[PDB]
C-alpha cells in the first residue's frame, strides 16, 4: 500500500541511488540479484519490501526506481555492475549526448528528447503501484541533467499527476567548494523553475558532509561513496516509518505540511546523528539527549549554513531504534528551554516527532559505527537566506558582464528567463527576510 | 607495466560491491538471549482477591455475617 517511486536524475542522483538501493536491499534482505537468499523464512512471508521493490510471481524483486542520465557511463556502470540483475533494463534510461553543465541543454533541446520516455516509465511504475505516497527526486543544482532535466521532469510531473507529493533531495552548491563555473546560473534557473512545481526540497552539500566525515568519522579521503552513504542513511531514516513498526508513524505526505509554512519557503535542511566512528562510539554514550543536542549543534549540519544566524521555523525529528518517548520529550523540551536555539514567534509548536522501533542499519565495509539510536533532524531555518544571498551575488557577478550567456542563447533560452529568474530569487529573499522578522 | 592495485579498478566496483561480511547475523538478530518467560494471568492470580467475583446479593440467605 505504501508506495514511493524514486527517480534519480543526474550523475550525482544515480550514484546516490546506487547507495540508497544498496541500503534498501540490505535492509529488506534482498540479494543483489534481486531475490531472497534462497529462503522465504527471513521475516517469514513478509511483504514489507512493497514500499520500494515491486514483486513478480517468481521471486524477483524489481525496484521502483527510474535512473535517468543523458550521458552514458554511470548508468551503464549500474547496468554492468554488481546490481545488474536487480534493475529492470528499461528502468535505466540513457541518452546519446550529454547536457554538458547547461540548463538550456537540460531543459529545451536535449532534455526534451528523453522526457516522454521517462514519463512513460514513471507512468508504468505508477500504474503498477497500488497507491502512491509520492515521488523522491534525487538531483544536484550543479547543472545539466540534474538541473535542467530535473526541472523539466518536475514541471511535467506537476502537469500530469496534479497534487501528488514530490520530495526532493538536492545537492545544493557549496559556499566555496565548487566543481563548475555555471553552478550559480543553473541553480538560479532551476530554483526559479521549481518554486511552484515542488513540495519540499531537502538540501545537502558536499562541503558540510566533507567536514562531517573529517571531524566525526575521521576520514582523510572521503570520496563520493561515503557522501552517498550518509545521504542514503538520511533518506532511509526518512522512509523507515512506511516499512517498519514505530511508536509514532510518519509518512511521505506529512513532510510538506509540517515543514512548509509558506508556498515558496520549501527548502529545508538535513542532519543525521550520531554520525560517528567505531573508536569514538566506544567512548561516547550516544544517549537520546546527547544525539538530540548533537542535531541542533551548529557543527553537525549538512547544508554548511550556521543556523544560529537564522531562526527555526519548523523541525521534523525522526528517531529510530530503542529510543523512548519520555526521554524524547525531555530532550526536545530542554532544547526549547535552551537559548542558543531560537525559533520564530509565530510557530510555538515547531516540532514533528516520529519514532520508529527499527535500529539503524550498518552497511558492510561502511564508515558509520553501530548505534542503537539515531535522529534524522529536518529543520527549516531562515538562515538559508545567507546562502541565497551568496548564490545571488555570484549570479550577479557573472551576469553583469553577461558571461557564459551565449551558450544558453544558442541552446534555446533568451535573456528574459535569466532576468525573471533573478527577479524571482530576489523576491524569495525578501520573502525570507519578511518571514524572519 | 600497469600498477597492480590501483591500475584499472573503478570506484563503484571497488566500493558498491556485493555485501559479504561475517557480521550479518548481528544485523537482524541480537546474540543476547531474552532473560524471561511470561505466561498469561492465571486463576491463582485472579482469585487471590478475598471474596472475588461475588456481589452483595449473595449474602442473602447465606448464614454468614457481613465483615466485607
Amino acid at each position: 500500500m505504501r508506495e514511493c517511486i524514486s527517480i534519480h536524475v543526474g550523475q550525482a542522483g544515480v550514484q546516490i541511488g546506487n547507495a540508497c538501493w544498496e541500503l534498501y536491499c540490505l535492509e529488506h534482505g534482498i540479494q543483489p540479484d534481486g531475490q531472497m537468499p534462497s529462503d522465504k523464512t527471513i521475516g517469514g512471508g513478509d511483504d514489507s519490501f512493497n514500499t520500494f521493490f515491486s514483486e513478480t510471481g517468481a521471486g524477483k524483486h524489481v525496484p521502483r526506481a527510474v535512473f535517468v542520465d543523458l550521458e552514458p557511463t554511470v548508468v551503464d556502470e549500474v547496468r554492468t555492475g554488481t546490481y545488474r540483475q536487480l534493475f529492470h533494463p528499461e528502468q535505466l534510461i540513457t541518452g546519446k549526448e550529454d547536457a554538458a553543465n547547461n540548463y538550456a541543454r537540460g531543459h529545451y533541446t536535449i532534455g526534451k528528447e528523453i522526457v516522454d520516455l521517462v514519463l512513460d516509465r514513471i507512468r508504468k511504475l505508477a500504474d503498477q503501484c497500488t497507491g502512491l505516497q509520492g515521488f523522491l527526486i534525487f538531483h544536484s543544482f550543479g547543472g545539466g541533467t540534474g538541473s535542467g532535466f530535473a526541472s523539466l521532469l518536475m514541471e511535467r510531473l506537476s502537469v500530469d499527476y496534479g497534487k501528488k507529493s514530490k520530495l526532493e533531495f538536492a545537492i545544493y552548491p557549496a559556499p566555496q567548494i565548487s566543481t563548475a563555473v555555471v553552478e550559480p546560473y543553473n541553480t538560479i534557473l532551476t530554483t526559479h523553475t521549481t518554486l511552484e512545481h515542488s513540495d519540499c526540497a531537502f538540501m545537502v552539500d558536499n562541503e558540510a558532509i566533507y567536514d562531517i566525515c573529517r571531524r566525526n568519522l575521521d576520514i582523510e579521503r572521503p570520496t563520493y561513496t561515503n557522501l552517498n552513504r550518509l545521504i542514503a542513511q538520511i533518506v532511509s531514516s526518512i522512509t523507515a516509518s512506511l516499512r517498519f513498526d514505530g511508536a509514532l508513524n510518519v509518512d511521505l505526505t506529512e513532510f510538506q505540511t509540517n515543514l512548509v509554512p509558506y508556498p515558496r519557503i520549501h527548502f529545508p535542511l538535513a542532519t543525521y546523528a550520531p554520525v560517528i566512528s567505531a573508536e569514538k562510539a566506544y567512548h561516547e554514550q550516544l544517549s537520546v539527549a546527547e544525539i538530540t543536542n548533537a542535531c541542533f549543534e551548529p557543527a553537525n549540519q549538512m547544508v554548511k549554513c550556521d543556523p544560529r544566524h537564522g531562526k527555526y521555523m519548523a523541525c521534523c525529528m525522526l528517531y529510530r531504534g530503542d529510543v523512548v518517548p519520555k526521554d524524547v520529550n525531555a530532550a526536545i523540551a530542554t532544547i526549547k528551554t535552551k537559548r542558543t536555539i531560537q525559533f520564530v514567534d509565530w510557530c510555538p509548536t515547531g516540532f514533528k516527532v516520529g519514532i520508529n522501533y527499527q535500529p539503524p542499519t550498518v552497511v558492510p565495509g561502511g564508515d558509520l559505527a553501530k548505534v542503537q539510536r539515531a535522529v534524522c533532524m529536518l529543520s527549516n531555518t531562515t538562515a538559508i537566506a545567507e546562502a541565497w544571498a551568496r548564490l545571488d551575488h555570484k549570479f550577479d557577478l557573472m551576469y553583469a558582464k553577461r558571461a557564459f550567456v551565449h551558450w544558453y542563447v544558442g541552446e534555446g533560452m533568451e535573456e528574459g528567463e535569466f532576468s525573471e529568474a533573478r527577479e524571482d530569487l530576489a523576491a524569495l529573499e525578501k520573502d525570507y527576510e519578511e518571514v524572519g522578522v | 607495466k600497469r600498477v597492480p592495485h590501483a591500475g584499472m579498478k573503478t570506484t563503484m566496483t571497488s566500493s558498491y560491491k556485493t555485501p559479504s561480511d561475517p557480521k550479518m547475523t548481528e544485523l537482524f538478530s541480537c546474540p543476547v538471549d531474552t532473560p524471561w518467560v511470561i505466561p498469561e494471568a492465571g486463576p491463582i492470580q485472579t482469585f487471590s482477591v478475598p471474596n472475588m467475583y461475588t456481589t452483595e446479593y449473595k449474602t442473602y440467605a447465606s448464614g454468614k455475617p457481613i465483615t466485607v
Binding site: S277, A281, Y282, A369, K370 | V3, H5, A6
Partner: peptide, 26 residues
C-alpha cells in the same frame, strides 16, 4: 564496534601496503 575498528585498521594497513606497492612499481 571493537571488531569493526580492528578490521578497519587491518584494511588501512592493507591500503598502505597496496599504495606502497603501486608507488614502487611506478
Amino acid at each position: 564496534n571493537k571488531s569493526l575498528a580492528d578490521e578497519q585498521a587491518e584494511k588501512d594497513r592493507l591500503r598502505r601496503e597496496q599504495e606502497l606497492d603501486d608507488n614502487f612499481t611506478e
